Structure formats: structure tokens, C-alpha cells
Amino acid sequence: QHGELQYLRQVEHIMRCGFKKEDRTGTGTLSVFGMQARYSLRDEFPLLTTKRVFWKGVLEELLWFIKGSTNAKELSSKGVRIWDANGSRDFLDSLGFSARQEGDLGPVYGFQWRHFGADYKDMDSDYSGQGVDQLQKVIDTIKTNPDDRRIIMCAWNPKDLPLMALPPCHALCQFYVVNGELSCQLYQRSGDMGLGVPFNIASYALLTYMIAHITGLQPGDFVHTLGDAHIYLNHIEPLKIQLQREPRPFPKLRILRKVETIDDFKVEDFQIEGYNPHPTI
């Protein structure tokens, strides 16, 4: 019945039927290919309870995406340092970007969502009016023709791939509308069930809530589709303890004011109610 049981079953499935694989760095993982879960967004927000999810991070990262920013320093100054390692001088130099400034992640998510097709110079350049604004295109389509089957937002850009500090995990997401409800399916090519995935679920569940607010629709379902679903070997024991835990009722997300555009959203507009996560592992 509870939505979190689906995630727990997926983690259990990988431990149960996964194959021993390897990484880019070489650490070792248990992996399964092709998984799908469906989380209900009706009167509840999917922020996992068996293990704490960095809420401030998902909120600040998404507002940073919408802003169209590719500067990691703009997210770091907000207290969210999850992209700092990829924007460092050392990492950018190992990829061959020496003339590039520090913090410049290349044409990642934000740039693809707002300026698809545009030529990328640097993080400080003005890209207004350049490229295809997929985000606004999504919102407008939901407002004009909700039955459309092409309401898609793609971050996977083969042409811009060599320039990105890190290739997109969330390659593509599609929206759907029935009975005044807004659903969303995410295609995640690679997902770490131990840390990344629970953060990813929350992020896109928030995106769906945001767009539903602007279009006057109600949040429906969130279909999470995975490509390479893995669990790192050094996390087998902690996750074993997490599987034994009983899920607490999912919290509730509340938007405190009526906003017209997606750009007008602020941290103060969001309120999480009833989030009681289990201790640390």
C-alpha cells in the first residue's frame, strides 16, 4: 500500500537478482537493468522515511535548474555542495577544460531545459532568446493542448555531450494529463539506489507539483523508469538494516502562494508537513 515499499522492493530485488559489475572508477556494484515504479502524488509527497533525504538540496538544485544556470558556485553559495567536485579546477582539467573557469559545468541540465540547440560559450554568457525552451514549451502545451503525446523535456544532447562536466542521469521526462491530473515519467539511464535515487524521486515529484500548480492541475502519478539500477558493494550492509525498517507516512508538500510563472518560485513558497525520517545508518 505504502509508496516507499516499492523502492524497498527494488533495492531488495537488486540484492536478490543482481550481477556483480564494475564502475568508471572501479569500486564494484550489484546491478539489474530495467526497473519501473509508480509513486502516487495525491495528497502526499514521496520523500523517503527509512533514510533521510536532503530536502534543501533537491529544492535548491531544482530552482537552480529552472534558472538555467550551469555555474556550480551559484548552488554552493546556497549551502548545497553536491556539484562542487565536478566544478573544481582539478576535475575540469582532467577532462581537458583548462581555459574554462572554475564552477563551469558546461551545457548541463539547466542549459538543456532552457536553451536546447544554442551554442555554449561559458556560464557567464547571456543565452536569452537562444535555443528551444523545453520547460516553457511543456507548460504552454499543457495549457493549450493537454492531450498532446509529445510533452517531453530532454536533457540528453549527443552534440553537447563532450562539453558537459557530467553526462545527464535523468535523460528525459514526459508529462501526461487525464481527469485534471498531471503525471510524469522519468527515464533515468543510471541510478544509485543507496544515495542518488531517493533524491531523484523527490526532485521530479517536486517538478510535477510545481508545473501542476501553474497549470491548475492536480498532481497525479510519478513513474520512475531506470536503466542501470545499481547498489555499491560497500552499501550492502547499511541497506540491509534499512530494509528492516518500517516506513512512516509520507509527508505533505504545500505551496503557500499562487505563482504565475515557473521562474517566480522561491524557497519560501514550499512547506513540508509531517516528515519524520528514521535515524542515520
Place this chain on the structure above:
Amino acid sequence: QHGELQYLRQVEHIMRCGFKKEDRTGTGTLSVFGMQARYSLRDEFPLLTTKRVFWKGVLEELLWFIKGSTNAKELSSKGVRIWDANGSRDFLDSLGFSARQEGDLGPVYGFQWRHFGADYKDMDSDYSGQGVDQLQKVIDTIKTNPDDRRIIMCAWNPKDLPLMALPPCHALCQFYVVNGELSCQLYQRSGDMGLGVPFNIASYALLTYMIAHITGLQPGDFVHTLGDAHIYLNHIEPLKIQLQREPRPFPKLRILRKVETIDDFKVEDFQIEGYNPHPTI
């Protein structure tokens, strides 16, 4: 359990729990959002048996994709009329392509696989060395680094969308490797369960077999993920008759010769074995 039961249950689920939504054609559909199925490619080929599928069509269409052709007449000259209507004078005029010559479908599938990012002129143009050859990249990645989690081939191009006579249904596909087996996951944003889906399943299964042959691996699984899965109202009755029939064993696909490249593949290299379907409806 037979692999075709997954497809049949999916059709049953859409008639039972689906929603009466609308279409761009305005013909009316029964729709569901977010489905997934897994078809084993180990010593068998997922060519549906409860209804005869046009094998010549899926074979000729795929070699047409690989060739990079966007000329519908180039496919028609082989007895495969599947894209004739999309390339006809009346259809091209209605979309606003009055200057385009017959058969010019625009930057469709084949162009996106071989020349992503290239500026399209027309079907009789030379695009050699232009764009990103995604197909070649996938093959080279599987050979030199099989554990990679970015083995993706994307046909969804927001920039080229308004130029396409036929919008991409199979928007993205990913490849995966374990135990010397190649698996593929396809993200179909829109799929007509009555006609298109059975054809699409065979198409990418064949592609997996093709790439697996060149890379020296064995065909693994074909994961089919759907977005807007639908059934047209006029297809309800003939599908009710298909649900009644019992699945016969899947045929086997045999590659008659050792081919080095994806471009060296020809029709004479393939032969379907043991295909005994039910009378076409």
C-alpha cells in the same frame, strides 16, 4: 510463461483500466501512462504469434534507418508502403512543406541516428562527416568499454521536431552489458498497441541482434518501456479476438554470415526460423 503474455496482458489492462482520451487524428483512444515489459532474446525472437507481423517491413525499415535515408520512396521501392502517406504531396502540403519533393520526410529516425545535430537540407543531400554518428558510437563503446552507463542513442531532437513529417515514437534507447550479453531498453513516448507496438518490438530486438553480432556478444533482454500506451476505439473488436488466441513459441532469428560492420548488413544475411503465427487480422 510465454513472453507474449506480457503484451496481451498490457492490451487487456488498457481495455479494463484505461481512460477515454483524445487524439491529434481525433479518432479517440483508450489510454494508460507508464508500462514496462521484458522480452528474453536468448535463443528466440519476439515476433508476435497471435497475429502475423509484416517481417519484410521491419527488416527493410531498419536497414533503411541504418542507411540514414529519409526518403520514403527509397523504402517503398522494396514493397514496404508503411511511410508512403507521410511522404505524399497532400500530407507534406498540410504540414507546410509545399517546397519539399515527394518522399522527403525531413530529419527523421535515420538522420538522427547517423547525423544528430546536422543542418538538414533535403533527402538527396550529402551529410557525410556532419553531425554525431550515434550508432557508430554505441558500437565502439560496447567494444572498448562495455560497463559504460551512457550507451545511448537518441532520436528525440527538439530543434528538428518542426521539420519532421513524422515525430519520433521510439524517442530513446539504451544498451547494457553483463555476462557477455547485450540488452536494450527502449523508451516509446507514444505507442499504438494494436498496430505499431508489435512492429516496434521486433524492430529493436533485431537491432540488438545486429549489434550483438558485431560486438561478439550474445543477445540478452529487450526491455520495452512505454509512455502513452493506447488503443484506438476502432481497434477494440479485432483486439478482443486476438486476446482469445493462444501464443505459439517465438521464432528464431539466424544471421547467415559473419559481418564486420552495421553498414555491411543486407537482407540476404537474415532468415526467420520457425514462425507459425495465427491468421492476420
